Amino acid sequence: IRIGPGQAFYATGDIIGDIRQAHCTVSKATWNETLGKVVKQLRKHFGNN
Amino acid sequence: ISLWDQSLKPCVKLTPLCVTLQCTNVTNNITDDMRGELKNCSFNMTTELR
Amino acid sequence: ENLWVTVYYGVPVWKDAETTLFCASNVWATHACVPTDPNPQEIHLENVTEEFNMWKNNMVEQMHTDIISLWDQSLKPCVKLTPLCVTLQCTNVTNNITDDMRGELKNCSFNMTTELRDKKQKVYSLFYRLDVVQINNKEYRLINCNTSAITQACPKVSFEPIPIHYCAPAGFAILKCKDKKFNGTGPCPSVSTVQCTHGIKPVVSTQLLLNGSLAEEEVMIRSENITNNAKNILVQFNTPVQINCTRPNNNTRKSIRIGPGQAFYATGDIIGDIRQAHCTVSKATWNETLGKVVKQLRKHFGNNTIIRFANSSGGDLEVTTHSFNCGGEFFYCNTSGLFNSTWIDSITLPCRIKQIINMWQRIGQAMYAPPIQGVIRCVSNITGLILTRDGGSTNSTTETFRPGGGDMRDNWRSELYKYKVVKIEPLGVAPTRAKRRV
Amino acid sequence: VQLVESGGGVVQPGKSVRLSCVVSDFPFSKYPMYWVRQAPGKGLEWVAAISGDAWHVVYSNSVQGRFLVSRDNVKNTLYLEMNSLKIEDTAVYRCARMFQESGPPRLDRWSGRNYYYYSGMDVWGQGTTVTVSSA
Amino acid sequence: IVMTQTPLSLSVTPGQPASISCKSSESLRQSNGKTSLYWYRQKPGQSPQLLVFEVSNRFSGVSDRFVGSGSGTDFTLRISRVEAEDVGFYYCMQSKDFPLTFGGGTKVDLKR
Amino acid sequence: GFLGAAGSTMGAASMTLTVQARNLLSGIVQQTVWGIKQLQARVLAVERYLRDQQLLGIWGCSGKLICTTNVPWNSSWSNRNLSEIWDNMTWLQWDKEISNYTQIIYGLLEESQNQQEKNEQDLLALD
Amino acid sequence: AVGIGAVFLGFLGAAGSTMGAASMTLTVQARNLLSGIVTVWGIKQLQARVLAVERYLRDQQLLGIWGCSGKLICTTNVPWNSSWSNRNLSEIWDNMTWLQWDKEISNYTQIIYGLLEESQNQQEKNEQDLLALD
Amino acid sequence: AVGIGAVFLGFLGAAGSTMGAASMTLTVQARNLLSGIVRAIEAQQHLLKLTVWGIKQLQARVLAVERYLRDQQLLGIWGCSGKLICTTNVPWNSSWSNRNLSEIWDNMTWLQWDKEISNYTQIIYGLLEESQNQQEKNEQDLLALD
Ligand SMILES: *[C@@H]1O[C@H](CO[C@@H]2O[C@@H](C)[C@@H](O)[C@@H](O)[C@@H]2O)[C@@H](O[C@@H]2O[C@H](CO)[C@@H](O[C@@H]3O[C@H](CO[C@H]4O[C@H](CO)[C@@H](O)[C@H](O)[C@@H]4O[C@@H]4O[C@H](CO)[C@@H](O)[C@H](O)[C@H]4NC(C)=O)[C@@H](O)[C@H](O[C@H]4O[C@H](CO)[C@@H](O[C@@H]5O[C@H](CO)[C@@H](O)[C@H](O)[C@H]5NC(C)=O)[C@H](O)[C@@H]4O[C@@H]4O[C@H](CO)[C@@H](O[C@@H]5O[C@H](CO)[C@H](O)[C@H](O)[C@H]5O)[C@H](O)[C@H]4NC(C)=O)[C@@H]3O)[C@H](O)[C@H]2NC(C)=O)[C@H](O)[C@H]1NC(C)=O
Ligand SMILES: *[C@@H]1O[C@H](CO[C@@H]2O[C@@H](C)[C@@H](O)[C@@H](O)[C@@H]2O)[C@@H](O[C@@H]2O[C@H](CO)[C@@H](O[C@@H]3O[C@H](CO[C@H]4O[C@H](CO[C@@H]5O[C@H](CO)[C@@H](O[C@@H]6O[C@H](CO)[C@H](O)[C@H](O)[C@H]6O)[C@H](O)[C@H]5NC(C)=O)[C@@H](O)[C@H](O)[C@@H]4O[C@@H]4O[C@H](CO)[C@@H](O[C@@H]5O[C@H](CO)[C@H](O)[C@H](O)[C@H]5O)[C@H](O)[C@H]4NC(C)=O)[C@@H](O)[C@H](O[C@H]4O[C@H](CO)[C@@H](O)[C@H](O)[C@@H]4O)[C@@H]3O)[C@H](O)[C@H]2NC(C)=O)[C@H](O)[C@H]1NC(C)=O
Ligand SMILES: *[C@@H]1O[C@H](CO)[C@@H](O[C@@H]2O[C@H](CO)[C@@H](O[C@@H]3O[C@H](CO[C@H]4O[C@H](CO)[C@@H](O)[C@H](O[C@H]5O[C@H](CO)[C@@H](O)[C@H](O)[C@@H]5O)[C@@H]4O)[C@@H](O)[C@H](O[C@H]4O[C@H](CO)[C@@H](O)[C@H](O)[C@@H]4O[C@H]4O[C@H](CO)[C@@H](O)[C@H](O)[C@@H]4O)[C@@H]3O)[C@H](O)[C@H]2NC(C)=O)[C@H](O)[C@H]1NC(C)=O
Ligand SMILES: *[C@@H]1O[C@H](CO)[C@@H](O[C@@H]2O[C@H](CO)[C@@H](O[C@@H]3O[C@H](CO)[C@@H](O)[C@H](O)[C@@H]3O)[C@H](O)[C@H]2NC(C)=O)[C@H](O)[C@H]1NC(C)=O
Ligand SMILES: *[C@@H]1O[C@H](CO)[C@@H](O[C@@H]2O[C@H](CO)[C@@H](O)[C@H](O)[C@H]2NC(C)=O)[C@H](O)[C@H]1NC(C)=O
Ligand SMILES: *[C@@H]1O[C@H](CO)[C@@H](O[C@@H]2O[C@H](CO)[C@@H](O)[C@H](O)[C@H]2NC(C)=O)[C@H](O)[C@H]1NC(C)=O
Ligand SMILES: *[C@@H]1O[C@H](CO)[C@@H](O[C@@H]2O[C@H](CO)[C@@H](O)[C@H](O)[C@H]2NC(C)=O)[C@H](O)[C@H]1NC(C)=O
Ligand SMILES: *[C@@H]1O[C@H](CO)[C@@H](O[C@@H]2O[C@H](CO)[C@@H](O)[C@H](O)[C@H]2NC(C)=O)[C@H](O)[C@H]1NC(C)=O
Ligand SMILES: *[C@@H]1O[C@H](CO)[C@@H](O[C@@H]2O[C@H](CO)[C@@H](O)[C@H](O)[C@H]2NC(C)=O)[C@H](O)[C@H]1NC(C)=O
Ligand SMILES: *[C@@H]1O[C@H](CO)[C@@H](O)[C@H](O)[C@H]1NC(C)=O
Ligand SMILES: *[C@@H]1O[C@H](CO)[C@@H](O)[C@H](O)[C@H]1NC(C)=O
Ligand SMILES: *[C@@H]1O[C@H](CO)[C@@H](O)[C@H](O)[C@H]1NC(C)=O
Ligand SMILES: *[C@@H]1O[C@H](CO)[C@@H](O)[C@H](O)[C@H]1NC(C)=O
Ligand SMILES: *[C@@H]1O[C@H](CO)[C@@H](O)[C@H](O)[C@H]1NC(C)=O
Ligand SMILES: *[C@@H]1O[C@H](CO)[C@@H](O)[C@H](O)[C@H]1NC(C)=O
Ligand SMILES: *[C@@H]1O[C@H](CO)[C@@H](O)[C@H](O)[C@H]1NC(C)=O
Ligand SMILES: *[C@@H]1O[C@H](CO)[C@@H](O)[C@H](O)[C@H]1NC(C)=O
Ligand SMILES: *[C@@H]1O[C@H](CO)[C@@H](O)[C@H](O)[C@H]1NC(C)=O
């Protein structure tokens, strides 16, 4: 949409179909193994127990 | 920061947007978890003619 | 045998590269650059041949960049004019008029604000119909309002072209051919080396070569691939051709405030009968020069085909009529009468004027000029032409040639064709039979 | 141009041979040479490549510890050797030439390190094949 | 550095344009200022013959139906006027880094 | 003359280069948008002259303009006979015949400069 | 599509070696002082180039004022004062790197500079014009 | 708690002295053509990129470098490069003065001598350039007969 001399604006139209929700998706077990390695290194400087 | 400032110079200032917004909700074929996000609003604004 | 090496200093070596050049000695020029030198400097050499490739050296490209940069450097402290896209109610003028200038001038009144935020005022002036478009009695707007906005020209610094030398930095050189019968390209056999160039005047032109240089021997014709029409055709004359151009009318200009430190220059009332501004050339020298051109064309053409001239292809007013900068102002003069000739005392050149000027193909700008009060003459020479070639003929009959080429680059190729930048390396090595005594 | 690929045969595992490749019609001291490999009923495979002046040499990922290649600029003749063979090393062995003429080396003034430059090929000869067998 | 042919193979008919791709796995913009993708074709029982070097530059002594195309993302080919002499296998080849790699195989024939 | 020995043989223009040398012993003597270019031009001139004076000053050849050194000329770079070079070839042709081996020649001159001339001088100083 | 064919020394390769042995690679550094080129970015390019020019001219001026200009390493006539170190001539040349020696003497620099300037002026140039006349 | 101590010659330490004695502080006097601030300038050397002011500082530094190059190059044209003083082979023109040396070397200073001889300049430059050219290479070419 033009708004001024040499000026225009970009407005949002419409959406086909549904209205959904954006999101993210990862693995699970690699996360667990990663945090296991993390706490393995973490026990090297704090109280292990 | 300098290059990011160098980017935003020649573009368009958006001063006529601070106006009042008459609004309504969105209905058509919506997932109920997304209720509240989108809003259909309208207003007055000038064209290239003054 | 025992062969050892000597290092030599100061040995003439060409290297073929390109660097950045140097200023020499108004909007175009500077109020401050380096002063020139009165002494020439040029040494003829011998037994050196080299092909000088035209259409390739970016000295044209550097000049193009620099001219557009200085043009933008001009309008920086000038004044914005964004409240001018207000609506225009207009009416017509039918007083002290010649019947060929009917409907041009437009008496248009409009509201426009003062320096007080509470106070506007009635404002009316006279405009050209060429720069005014119709919105829909009937109300109009300007052409610039659905595109780039416009500024007022700072009316203090003139437009006159100045001879500009280019120079090279130290340790560098400029090579220059000497063939009077030089082609577009080819190995030039005669070498002249200079440090700086000659004076160059950067005239904006759309169809001709005003105030240009002159060829020595005869008309010579420049293009790369004559068989193809994808290139243009560059043609230079031998002797100059006179042309006068003038504005007849008694120009006046008022002055209307806009805001704080802002003053628009509108149109004042004109006194006297109104005629059309126009131009005039000779005819006999024109006929002779065109006979020379028809003579020179048929070397690389059919010697017994037909050569015809016609109007241009039409379309944009940038490429339709010839445009130039007499009187600090831009004129639109159709030259359809010059090309009413086929082959095998004066001429009237009526013109058009616009107040609002769109420059180079970048549509993100817009420029405006105020009127100059009074009566203006202008005299100039004519030195060469730009032509095209059509395509689709049935084996060398009915050849029609037209002018085109809406670019400023070939205007500067047509000067800097002689030139090429060469780097200097004064250090070399070679072997010998001598020895190094400890 | 003349370029042959001699040297067919058949062997059991655990041998040592010598291969030849005769060239003509180019100034042999300038060019690099390759060695490609084509399995039966299959595509192609690169093996080895010798430098232009016969001082640099690279191998494939397999035979680093097996092969040896050398250039005779005098006789204009390539010599290849393949040792400690396997039956599954049966393929087409060809002796082909880089297209682009390489030049002299480059010496940077930053820790020397003379560099070379290579590119692909244009000309293949007919070929040969040694089938490493068992019986 | 690996490299794939795209697609596998195709039977073609005359009076038709052609286009054969070869997907990269890197971008091989050489410091000399180009990309090292070559094509060369063989025929059955015969030796290969060089098709096109310099990405888009026809080899010397080759009919005008053969040019090159593409940049460091992925590449294609360009053949008009399909003729029975243009059958065999067409291979794309990396010549940037050691070790080299090759196109798999493009079976090209007529249609019955 | 200013680059007057252009279309000559190397052995032909082998005597009058001293007049060229005195005439090439000048350039700074006898003296906004464009000023940026002027600054860059001055920078380029200074950098080139310092490049040349550095490369002179590293070797033993930084006094006179012709000199001798202690490197045997290897026959791998060229193979042309001596009179063939000095009487049948220009400078540009010799340039294109040598402009791949230049850096190695520089490095050999550098090593000949360092070795057997300064630490050798240092051992010669001890009596 | 390249190979590597190393011949000569590294840039600052000899820095971990001993002084009397690492004295033979001094060429490479001065070979590599004024290269690397071999809106805001060109601004700082020119900034860097100017800084390089300034340091190189500074050190060549310090060379030129002394009578050890143009050439590489040389001699003088200033006898050593033992108030700075007191080694016995083997521990430095055979048992010490350069960063060690630099941290040993980095308080006595300006005095040594001034005394070399003193002996370079005095009894060398007025003495020359004494010798330039009977 | 800062205390001062021993002394040296110093900058401009002999501008009001006898020339035959003041001729020996040339080193300290000539060191500071490229310095005088020999101190954390580097930060403002860095961050002054988007203004005209560092551009003018760049102007100043480049101009100073060029002045040093002009002086050293003009000395380098003569055969007296890399030295402090040199004798030459141009005979003095006694038209220019006829004072004895015992007044110049004992009871005359440098600015006095400057105000005296300030018009004989370019003649001396040309004669020095001539003797550095004539027979300094021509008879040296004739001395190159080995
Ligand atoms: C120095 O160095 C350099 C380098 O280096 C540089 O620099 C430095 C500084 C550093 O930096 C570095 O790094 C750098 O790089 C060097 O250079 C070199 O040179 C050389 C020469 O020698 C070269 O080589 C060549 O190559 C070619 C290719 O390439 C080219 O081309 C392309 C395209 O065009 C391009 O791209 C490129 O570039 C090139 O070009 C060039 O380049 C250059 C460079 O720069 C430049 O300068 C120039 O200018 C350019 N040019 C143009 C034009 O462009 C290739 O190809 C070639 O080869 C060919 O040739 C040859 C010669 O002739 C031959 O041989 C012959 O053979 C025959 C046969 O029979 C015989 O007879 C004769 O005798 C012989 N001769 C002799 C002499 O030997 C060959 O063989 C070839 O030929 C061909 O072949 C083929 C085969 O195949 C054929 O084909 C065929 O055909 C048929 C028909 O047609 C059918 O079809 C069939 O199928 C087919 O196959 C053909 O034919 C033939 N031809 C004809 C004509 O015939 C060459 O070799 C290179 O390149 C370079 N390098 C680079 C890198 O580049 C130098 O040298 C050094 N030194 C000095 C002293 O300087
Ligand atoms: C002048 O100039 C010239 C030229 O120069 C050149 O050029 C220039 C431009 C530049 O570039 C430069 O640089 C160059 O150089 C010169 O010449 C030169 O010289 C020098 C001296 O004088 C030399 O040096 C030498 O070197 C050598 C080397 O060697 C190598 O090799 C070896 C072995 O050998 C082999 O053997 C085998 C067995 O027999 C054989 O095989 C066979 O063969 C035959 C014939 O051929 C047949 O075919 C059969 O079949 C077969 O089997 C072969 O062949 C051979 N080869 C040869 C080559 O010879 C060894 O041992 C050694 O070690 C060496 O090796 C090598 O190495 C390299 C390096 O390292 C390598 O590379 C590598 O690569 C990889 C991949 O990439 C990676 O990279 C790595 O890292 C690397 O390393 C390779 O591989 C290898 N190869 C082989 C094969 O192995 C040497 O040896 C010598 O030494 C000797 O002697 C000594 C004395 O003392 C002793 O001690 C020792 O022990 C020894 O013996 C020397 O050093 C050079 O080379 C040259 N050059 C050329 C090019 O050649 C001249 O000199 C001048 N002049 C003057 C006066 O100076
Ligand atoms: C190809 O090249 C040719 C060759 O150069 C070009 O031809 C030139 O064209 C330009 C215009 O494009 C001509 O310049 C203008 O000429 C005007 C003529 O005015 C005459 O009358 C006035 C009285 O009103 C006289 O004063 C003039 O006197 C001139 O000549 C004498 C003697 O030579 C000189 O002593 C004078 O100094 C004058 O030069 C003329 O007889 C002229 O008025 C005009 O000058 C105005 O503009 C400049 C701009 O800075 C002012 O400095 C100047 O004071 C004038 O401005 C006054 O008037 C305006 C309003 O009119 C006010 O706004 C100002 O404040 C001020 O009051 C300018 O000089 C040029 O003469 C002509 N060349 C020749 C040789 O004739 C072609 O144009 C070129 N081709 C193309 C396409 O451009
Ligand atoms: C430059 O622009 C055009 C194109 O050449 C010129 O207009 C042309 O003028 C001639 C002269 O009148 C016209 O010829 C006759 O015109 C009448 C009415 O237009 C027509 O009824 C006749 O049959 C005959 O065509 C010609 O048509 C006209 N062409 C166009 C396209 O308008 C114009 O005159 C030139 N500009 C100036 C200032 O002269
Ligand atoms: C957009 O402009 C309209 C036009 O004047 C304005 O809304 C008017 O408000 C007055 C005062 O309440 C009413 O009397 C009119 O009937 C309204 N007109 C319309 C068309 O709504 C107001 O300036 C803006 N209105 C909105 C909703 O943005
Ligand atoms: C300038 O502004 C004035 C208002 O201050 C306009 O005057 C009236 O405008 C209304 C609506 O625009 C009309 O209905 C009246 O007929 C106008 N009266 C008069 C006396 O003009 C005026 O029209 C404006 N003029 C322009 C050219 O914009
Ligand atoms: C800005 O002005 C008008 C829109 O009012 C456009 O003019 C059109 O031009 C085309 C071709 O010149 C004609 O076919 C249309 O009839 C014109 N429209 C009107 C309403 O007159 C003009 O193109 C606009 N500029 C841009 C860049 O869109
Ligand atoms: C100049 O342009 C012409 C076309 O105007 C080019 O001519 C082509 O020539 C080839 C072989 O000679 C033909 O196969 C093409 O059909 C021609 N083109 C056309 C459109 O017919 C010519 O190559 C160009 N270059 C020159 C003469 O150097
Ligand atoms: C070149 O100019 C001529 C006349 O100056 C134009 O010819 C006129 O074209 C219009 C448009 O169709 C006709 O209505 C007129 O009758 C023509 N008059 C004459 C005398 O020919 C011609 O159109 C112009 N060329 C282009 C491409 O517009
Ligand atoms: C924690 O326990 C582990 C083994 O159980 C042992 O190796 C480690 O030293 C202990 N660290 C601390 C901080 O107690
Ligand atoms: C002269 O120019 C024409 C037009 O391009 C063409 O014949 C050729 O390029 C030139 N002639 C020669 C012999 O190079
Ligand atoms: C053109 O102008 C010149 C100078 O003003 C004049 O001498 C000549 O008569 C004019 N010619 C015409 C046709 O107006
Ligand atoms: C025909 O063309 C040739 C050049 O190709 C020219 O010499 C000759 O004079 C021409 N014929 C006529 C009648 O002009
Ligand atoms: C020396 O040059 C002559 C010709 O000038 C040539 O015939 C001869 O082969 C050359 N000999 C050597 C050893 O280079
Ligand atoms: C140096 O001399 C002293 C006495 O002069 C002696 O005790 C010491 O061992 C010597 N050290 C070396 C390394 O020669
Ligand atoms: C002038 O200076 C000299 C040394 O610089 C000094 O001996 C003398 O006393 C000074 N003159 C006066 C009047 O103090
Ligand atoms: C120089 O000294 C001599 C010897 O006493 C004397 O004759 C002459 O007049 C003196 N000239 C000047 C200018 O002092
Ligand atoms: C300079 O000093 C000397 C010795 O004291 C004296 O003879 C001479 O007259 C003085 N010069 C002037 C101009 O007084």
Short mmCIF file of N, CA and C in Angstrom, two decimals, chain B:
data_model
loop_
_atom_site.label_atom_id
_atom_site.label_comp_id
_atom_site.label_asym_id
_atom_site.label_seq_id
_atom_site.Cartn_x
_atom_site.Cartn_y
_atom_site.Cartn_z
N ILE B 1 27.75 -3.52 14.83
CA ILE B 1 26.79 -2.45 15.08
C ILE B 1 26.89 -1.37 14.02
N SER B 2 28.12 -1.09 13.56
CA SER B 2 28.32 -0.08 12.52
C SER B 2 27.72 -0.51 11.20
N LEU B 3 27.92 -1.78 10.81
CA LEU B 3 27.34 -2.25 9.56
C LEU B 3 25.83 -2.35 9.65
N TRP B 4 25.30 -2.73 10.81
CA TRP B 4 23.86 -2.78 10.98
C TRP B 4 23.25 -1.38 10.94
N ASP B 5 23.99 -0.38 11.42
CA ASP B 5 23.54 1.00 11.26
C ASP B 5 23.66 1.45 9.82
N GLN B 6 24.68 0.97 9.12
CA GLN B 6 24.88 1.30 7.72
C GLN B 6 23.76 0.75 6.86
N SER B 7 23.15 -0.36 7.29
CA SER B 7 22.04 -0.95 6.55
C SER B 7 20.79 -0.08 6.61
N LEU B 8 20.41 0.36 7.80
CA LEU B 8 19.08 0.91 8.03
C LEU B 8 18.94 2.37 7.65
N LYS B 9 19.92 2.96 6.96
CA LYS B 9 19.82 4.38 6.62
C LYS B 9 18.81 4.67 5.51
N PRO B 10 18.92 4.10 4.30
CA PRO B 10 18.14 4.66 3.19
C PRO B 10 16.67 4.28 3.19
N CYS B 11 16.21 3.52 4.17
CA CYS B 11 14.87 2.95 4.11
C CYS B 11 13.84 3.97 4.59
N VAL B 12 12.63 3.49 4.85
CA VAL B 12 11.45 4.33 4.98
C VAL B 12 11.10 4.51 6.45
N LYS B 13 10.89 5.76 6.86
CA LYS B 13 10.43 6.05 8.21
C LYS B 13 8.92 5.85 8.31
N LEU B 14 8.49 5.26 9.42
CA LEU B 14 7.12 4.78 9.55
C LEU B 14 6.30 5.64 10.50
N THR B 15 6.49 6.95 10.42
CA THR B 15 5.80 7.85 11.34
C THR B 15 4.27 7.89 11.26
N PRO B 16 3.56 7.66 10.10
CA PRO B 16 2.10 7.78 10.18
C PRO B 16 1.38 6.58 10.77
N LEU B 17 2.08 5.70 11.47
CA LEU B 17 1.43 4.51 11.99
C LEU B 17 0.86 4.67 13.38
N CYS B 18 1.35 5.61 14.18
CA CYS B 18 0.86 5.78 15.55
C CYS B 18 -0.52 6.42 15.51
N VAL B 19 -1.52 5.58 15.28
CA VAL B 19 -2.92 5.98 15.22
C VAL B 19 -3.74 5.01 16.07
N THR B 20 -5.05 5.24 16.07
CA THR B 20 -6.00 4.44 16.83
C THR B 20 -6.48 3.28 15.97
N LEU B 21 -6.72 2.13 16.60
CA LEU B 21 -6.99 0.89 15.88
C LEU B 21 -8.33 0.31 16.32
N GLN B 22 -9.32 0.35 15.43
CA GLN B 22 -10.57 -0.36 15.63
C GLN B 22 -10.38 -1.80 15.17
N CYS B 23 -10.71 -2.76 16.03
CA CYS B 23 -10.25 -4.12 15.87
C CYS B 23 -11.39 -5.12 15.95
N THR B 24 -11.06 -6.37 15.60
CA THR B 24 -11.94 -7.52 15.76
C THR B 24 -11.09 -8.79 15.78
N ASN B 25 -11.68 -9.87 16.28
CA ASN B 25 -10.98 -11.13 16.46
C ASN B 25 -11.00 -11.97 15.19
N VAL B 26 -10.17 -13.01 15.19
CA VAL B 26 -10.02 -13.93 14.06
C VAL B 26 -10.76 -15.21 14.40
N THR B 27 -11.49 -15.77 13.43
CA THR B 27 -12.37 -16.91 13.69
C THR B 27 -12.15 -18.11 12.78
N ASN B 28 -11.81 -17.89 11.51
CA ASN B 28 -12.09 -18.86 10.45
C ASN B 28 -11.12 -20.03 10.48
N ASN B 29 -11.63 -21.19 10.92
CA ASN B 29 -10.93 -22.49 10.88
C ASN B 29 -9.60 -22.43 11.63
N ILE B 30 -9.71 -22.19 12.93
CA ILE B 30 -8.56 -21.89 13.78
C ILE B 30 -8.37 -23.02 14.78
N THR B 31 -7.11 -23.36 15.05
CA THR B 31 -6.78 -24.22 16.18
C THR B 31 -6.95 -23.42 17.47
N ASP B 32 -7.61 -24.03 18.46
CA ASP B 32 -7.97 -23.31 19.68
C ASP B 32 -6.78 -22.93 20.55
N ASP B 33 -5.61 -23.54 20.34
CA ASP B 33 -4.44 -23.09 21.08
C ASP B 33 -3.92 -21.76 20.56
N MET B 34 -4.20 -21.45 19.30
CA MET B 34 -3.79 -20.19 18.70
C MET B 34 -4.81 -19.08 18.90
N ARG B 35 -5.76 -19.25 19.82
CA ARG B 35 -6.73 -18.20 20.08
C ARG B 35 -6.09 -17.07 20.88
N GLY B 36 -6.21 -15.85 20.36
CA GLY B 36 -5.69 -14.67 21.00
C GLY B 36 -4.55 -14.00 20.26
N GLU B 37 -3.82 -14.74 19.42
CA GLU B 37 -2.63 -14.20 18.78
C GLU B 37 -2.99 -13.18 17.71
N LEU B 38 -3.73 -13.60 16.69
CA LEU B 38 -3.98 -12.74 15.55
C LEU B 38 -5.20 -11.87 15.76
N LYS B 39 -5.12 -10.65 15.22
CA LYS B 39 -6.16 -9.65 15.37
C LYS B 39 -6.33 -8.90 14.06
N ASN B 40 -7.58 -8.67 13.68
CA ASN B 40 -7.95 -7.94 12.48
C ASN B 40 -8.31 -6.52 12.90
N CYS B 41 -7.49 -5.55 12.53
CA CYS B 41 -7.67 -4.16 12.94
C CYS B 41 -7.64 -3.25 11.72
N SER B 42 -8.28 -2.09 11.84
CA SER B 42 -8.39 -1.14 10.75
C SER B 42 -8.22 0.28 11.27
N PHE B 43 -7.91 1.20 10.35
CA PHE B 43 -7.56 2.58 10.70
C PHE B 43 -7.62 3.45 9.45
N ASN B 44 -7.39 4.75 9.64
CA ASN B 44 -7.28 5.72 8.57
C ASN B 44 -5.82 6.09 8.35
N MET B 45 -5.48 6.43 7.11
CA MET B 45 -4.12 6.80 6.75
C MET B 45 -4.14 7.52 5.41
N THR B 46 -3.19 8.43 5.23
CA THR B 46 -3.10 9.22 4.02
C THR B 46 -2.38 8.46 2.92
N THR B 47 -2.72 8.80 1.68
CA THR B 47 -2.05 8.27 0.51
C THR B 47 -0.93 9.23 0.10
N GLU B 48 -0.41 9.08 -1.12
CA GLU B 48 0.60 10.01 -1.63
C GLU B 48 0.03 11.40 -1.83
N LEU B 49 -1.28 11.51 -2.05
CA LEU B 49 -1.94 12.80 -2.01
C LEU B 49 -2.04 13.29 -0.58
N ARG B 50 -1.74 14.57 -0.37
CA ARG B 50 -1.84 15.19 0.94
C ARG B 50 -3.24 15.67 1.26
#
